[PDB]
Amino acid sequence: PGQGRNNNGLEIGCVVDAASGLLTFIANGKELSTYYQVEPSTKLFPAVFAQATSPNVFQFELGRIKNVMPLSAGLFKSEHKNPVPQCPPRLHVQFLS
Amino acid sequence: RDDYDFLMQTSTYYYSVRIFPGQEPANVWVGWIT
Amino acid sequence: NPQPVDTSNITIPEKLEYFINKYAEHSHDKWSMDKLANGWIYGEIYSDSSKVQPLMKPYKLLSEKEKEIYRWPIKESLKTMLAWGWRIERTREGDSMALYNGYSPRAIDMSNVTLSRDLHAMAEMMAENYHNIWAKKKKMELESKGGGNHPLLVPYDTLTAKEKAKDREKAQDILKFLQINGYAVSRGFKDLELDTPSIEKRFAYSFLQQLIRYVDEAHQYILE
Numbered sequence: 001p002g003q004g005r006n007n008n009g010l011e012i013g014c015v016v017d018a019a020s021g022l023l024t025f026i027a028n029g030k031e032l033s034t035y036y037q038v039e040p041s042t043k044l045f046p047a048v049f050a051q052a053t054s055p056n057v058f059q060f061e062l063g064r065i066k067n068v069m070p071l072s073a074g075l076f077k078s079e080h081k082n083p084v085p086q087c088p089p090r091l092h093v094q095f096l097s
Numbered sequence: 098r099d100d101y102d103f104l105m106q107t108s109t110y111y112y113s114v115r116i117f118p119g120q121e122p123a124n125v126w127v128g129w130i131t
Numbered sequence: 132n133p134q135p136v137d138t139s140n141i142t143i144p145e146k147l148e149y150f151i152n153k154y155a156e157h158s159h160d161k162w163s164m165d166k167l168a169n170g171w172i173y174g175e176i177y178s179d180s181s182k183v184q185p186l187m188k189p190y191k192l193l194s195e196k197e198k199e200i201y202r203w204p205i206k207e208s209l210k211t212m213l214a215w216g217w218r219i220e221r222t223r224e225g226d227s228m229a230l231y232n233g234y235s236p237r238a239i240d241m242s243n244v245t246l247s248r249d250l251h252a253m254a255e256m257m258a259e260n261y262h263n264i265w266a267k268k269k270k271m272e273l274e275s276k277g278g279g280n281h282p283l284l285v286p287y288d289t290l291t292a293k294e295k296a297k298d299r300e301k302a303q304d305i306l307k308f309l310q311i312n313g314y315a316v317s318r319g320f321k322d323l324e325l326d327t328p329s330i331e332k333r334f335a336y337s338f339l340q341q342l343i344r345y346v347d348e349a350h351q352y353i354l355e
Contacts, residue, residue, distance in 0.1 A: 119243025
């Protein structure tokens with residue numbers, strides 16, 4: 001759309017269908033055209049590549065949208081049926097070194 | 098209101114990334130890696 | 132002796148009129164921020180004791196003379212930047228932006244927007260120029276009153292960070308909004324040719340040539 005990020009930071013939403021392997025992305029509440037289909041048993045790590053043009057770069061948000069499970073519910077086995085989003089201490093940001 | 102039964106039978110998971118205003122979006126990539 | 136580069140002769144291009152309007156809107160918007168934060172309220176009657184002011188109508192609803200106070204400093208800033216020759220270019224992104232193109236105002240946060248090294252140098256130069264403008268007005272007032280040397284009349288270089296704060300923030304935020312709008316601003320002058328292989332322009336060559344001339348002159352003086 002343009003000019004929709006200066007007012008409020010842009011939000012890409014990543015949804016993964018573990019039952020079908022369909023990777024689709026939504027940005028600013030509208031689905032993007034690009035989609036990825038992965039093969040079964042694929043282990044996918046959330047990842048962000050960024051070159052910093054600011055003191056603050058980005059922010060991992062672990063919320064949920066309508067009709068979708070939070071990320072912790074898929075990451076952890078004990079939280080498989082817990083709609084409340086969670087960020088347990090095991091989860092942490094890693095970087096290539 | 099989200100359907101509680103759909104949330105229990107579903108396998109779709111979500112996370113989002115906020116690029117703070119002032120950071121160039123062309124320099125930021127979001128998605129999944131193996 | 133303060134001399135800003137005179138901008139009366141130079142005129143703004145018509146293509147930058149979109150930016151002029153948009154930054155006038157953004158300045159009105161930050162003014163709405165401070166107005167609402169202080170607690171003034173919208174009302175057709177303008178009272179200072181009642182703490183009410185009608186200028187919470189949007190920028191389009193503002194009067195033409197009301198818009199003057201905003202785009203005026205904008206006009207001087209741009210004519211100052213252009214009188215220095217700094218070529219301002221206009222990217223495809225803003226072209227998409229122009230093609231794209233109960234009062235709840237909301238500004239654009241410039242906290243994370245950042246400039247480059249060279250852009251910082253340019254912002255510092257335009258900032259000191261604005262400060263010399265203020266210096267000329269203060270000095271005309273000063274020997275209009277005869278005396279009263281103002282403490283901040285010292286050069287911009289002599290100024291301190293706290294004194295430089297508001298000048299610097301203005302001179303930077305204008306460039307920040309220019310960048311986020313997408314205008315391409317760079318240096319005005321361009322190199323014509325550097326005669327790098329020229330041995331002459333090496334300092335040693337000129338030094339030794341001058342030494343040769345001096346030694347030969349001294350030789351003639353001792354011969355006579």
